[PDB]
Amino acid sequence: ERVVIGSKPFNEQYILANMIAILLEENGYKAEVKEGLGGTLVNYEALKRNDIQLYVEYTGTAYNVILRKQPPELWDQQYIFDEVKKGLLEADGVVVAAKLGFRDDAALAVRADWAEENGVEKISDLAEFADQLVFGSDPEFASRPDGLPQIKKVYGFEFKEVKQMEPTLMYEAIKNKQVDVIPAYTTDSRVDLFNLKILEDDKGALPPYDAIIIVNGNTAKDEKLISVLKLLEDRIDTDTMRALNYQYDVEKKDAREIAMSFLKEQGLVK
């Protein structure tokens, strides 16, 4: 039959929606992609209605926006994954078909050369350096329920100073060494373009956003289709997703051709 695939309006989603479409067509299905159908709830309600049969959601996003659940004291990856799986199934019969293998998290980033020289890889590594470092911030990060005050509480440090600025000036500020630490999304191509290092939230101050393929109840009962989606299980790590986003954002490549190239390299199409 025909499988309709939703997506949210940004790079990663255009690439992943097309990837699933191509893979399904390779395995005998007819697939349609609705590129930038809408945001989280446009897609989720479309999924419940069976106007679409699947899309790529994120665990923390499902936890907060869809299920409207209470933040835990500390964010644990699998706790949130299991709560989302149970929650979507009980409420709507929606099934988690696959974990893709990457998280698209709000995180902290620093310059990569400095991180290398000092062996900084996690937020807890910043402890001894914190009171010497300048933190760059925007309205988007400051408005978050989990932010700098939660980082202080969990990690036990505060930065030298906080410089507020427009979100479009953040990477320039860290590149020009006006600030030393910025909020950045883990799969954002600019992390690589500005030679930054993303840090592990090793203590769980911030929410996890594991990328998952979710399917409606009726589509979940198609054993062949599920098997095909399972070929993407742990297929794409955060480094890999970011480099795919780089092809879109920096190299200006078409999202579908980015997906096609990946699938061919992985031997899943041809």
Q: What determination technique applies here?
A: X-ray
Resolution of the entry in angstroms: 1.8
Do 222 and 268 fall into the same domain?
yes
Do 11 and 63 fall into the same domain?
yes
Do 180 and 266 fall into the same domain?
no
Do 19 and 8 fall into the same domain?
yes
Q: How far apart are CA 237 and CA 123, in angstroms?
A: 20
CATH of the domain at 127: 3.40.190.120
- Write out the two tokens for 83: 């709560």
- The single residue listed with the structure tokens 């949210």 is 8
Q: Residue 61 annotated as binding? A: yes
Do 3 and 72 fall into the same domain?
yes
Do 96 and 230 fall into the same domain?
yes
Do 179 and 236 fall into the same domain?
no
Do 28 and 159 fall into the same domain?
no
- Write out the two tokens for 106: 């709000």
Domain that holds residue 174: 105-208
Do 133 and 100 fall into the same domain?
no
Q: Residue 261: enclosing H or E segment and its boundaries? A: helix 255-265
Q: Residue 105 annotated as binding? A: no
CATH of the domain at 72: 3.40.190.10
Counted domains in the chain: 2
Do 2 and 100 fall into the same domain?
yes
Rounded (10°) angle between helices 238-249 and 255-265: 140
- Write out the two tokens for 29: 């299905």
Do 68 and 119 fall into the same domain?
no
Domain's final residue, options 168, 192, 208: 208
Q: Residue 8 annotated as binding? A: yes
Domain's final residue, options 208, 226, 251: 208
Q: Residue 237 annotated as binding? A: yes
Please check whether residue 213 is in contact with residue 54, taking contact to mean a CB–CB distance below 8 angstroms: yes
Do 115 and 239 fall into the same domain?
no
Q: How many C-beta neighbours within 10 Å does residue 257 have?
A: 13
Q: What residues pair up with 32 in beta bridges, in sequence order?
A: 4
* Long-range residue pairs from 125-128, CB within 8 A, at least 24 positions apart, any chain: 125/199, 126/155, 126/157, 126/181, 126/199, 127/155, 127/156, 127/157
Q: How far apart are CA 204 and CA 196, in angstroms?
A: 21
Q: CA-CA distances (angstroms) from residue 98 to 34, 35, 41, 232, 251? A: 20, 20, 20, 7, 29
The contacts of residue 31 (CB under 8 Å, 6+ apart) are 2, 3, 4, 5, 20, 21, 22, 24, 25
Domain's final residue, options 186, 208, 230: 208
The amino acid sitting at 117 is E
